[PDB]
């Protein structure tokens, strides 16, 4: 229903973009991007623009055998979402928001999503890394896992 994309990165982008404006804590809705939409020196928002979310798959998706039928793979998909802002409290609100938004869908039997399960499974803070002299991006992130049965065309 809400996504039906062929790949997890676009699926999570479609879930984050589908979110109501009322379900973001800040004054304005963030902008959602594939991590490779932006060049590194441009990465993160500028001042007087809303915060930016970068989404990608950081590690290998598993394709486990489900049965002796060979009819589906138990597919486990890995994602990370980074929140970038100049506001050290906005990145924290975005982390809270992303965990909330993606805590819908948690056990879709492929209802909204093309998956059995989309879940936040961990979160990182990187605010310690932004140096204090220069204005610069604070960064925080959500780690997401995603599971489903994916067809094999073995049985025609």
């Amino acid at each position: 229903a809400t996504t039906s994309a062929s790949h997890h990165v676009q699926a999570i982008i479609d879930l984050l973009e589908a979110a109501p404006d009322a379900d973001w804590t800040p004054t304005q809705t963030p902008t959602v991007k594939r991590y490779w939409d932006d060049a590194q020196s441009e990465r993160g928002p500028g001042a007087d623009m809303p915060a930016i979310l970068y989404v990608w798959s950081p590690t290998t998706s598993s394709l486990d055998r489900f049965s002796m039928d060979g009819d589906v793979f138990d597919q486990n998909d890995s994602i990370e979402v980074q929140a970038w802002s100049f506001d050290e409290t906005e990145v924290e609100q975005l982390q809270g928001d992303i965990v909330q938004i993606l805590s819908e869908y948690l056990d879709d039997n492929e209802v909204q999503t093309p998956y059995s399960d989309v879940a936040p499974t961990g979160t990182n803070d990187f605010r310690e890394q932004t140096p204090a002299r220069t204005t610069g991006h604070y960064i925080m992130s959500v780690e997401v896992e995603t599971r489903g049965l994916s067809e094999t065309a073995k049985n025609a």
């Binding site: 589906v72 948690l106 056990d107 039997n109 059995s116 049965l149």
Partner: protein, 156 residues
């Protein structure tokens, strides 16, 4: 007939009911749910043949076993109280509390929706406390239903 399909566990919603009223008894937070109809089997053999002459079934029940992690004060006080009552203390009477139990579970692709219902489940023992330091409490139940009252596809 309906194509066999895998099932995502968490999509299953379990509910307990008072058989006097069909009212719900609040219960939540399952981690395992095993429901297993059984009969005793008697096989006939005689000096005529090494092979089984006949086989027959008797002593029907349904094994119900559950692991869960949300404590229910209603479910416990029902089990103490016995049929058609609640109690805050052990009751010196001969009747176990009987629960109707239903589990509704969408198939992985939504291809069908299994509704399983069990009549007159009773539990020989009930954990009230199940503490381990540095963890949340987790509780195990074993019980026995009289029979399966429904096992059907309830999609559409």
């Amino acid at each position: 007939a309906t194509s066999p399909e895998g099932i995502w566990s968490n999509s299953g919603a379990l509910t307990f009911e008072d058989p006097a009223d069909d009212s719900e008894i609040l219960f939540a937070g399952v981690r395992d749910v095993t429901i297993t109809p059984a009969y005793e089997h008697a096989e006939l053999y005689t000096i005529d043949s090494t092979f089984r002459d006949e086989v027959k079934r008797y002593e029907h029940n349904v094994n119900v076993e559950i692991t869960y992690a949300k404590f229910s004060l209603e479910f416990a006080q029902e089990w103490l109280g016995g049929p058609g009552a609640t109690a805050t203390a052990s009751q010196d009477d001969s009747d176990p509390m009987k629960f109707n139990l239903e589990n509704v579970t969408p198939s992985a692709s939504g291809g069908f929706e299994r509704t399983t219902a069990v009549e007159n489940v009773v539990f020989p023992e009930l954990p009230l406390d199940s503490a381990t330091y540095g963890e949340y409490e987790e509780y195990s139940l074993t019980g026995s239903g009289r029979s399966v009252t429904n096992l059907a596809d309830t999609s559409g």
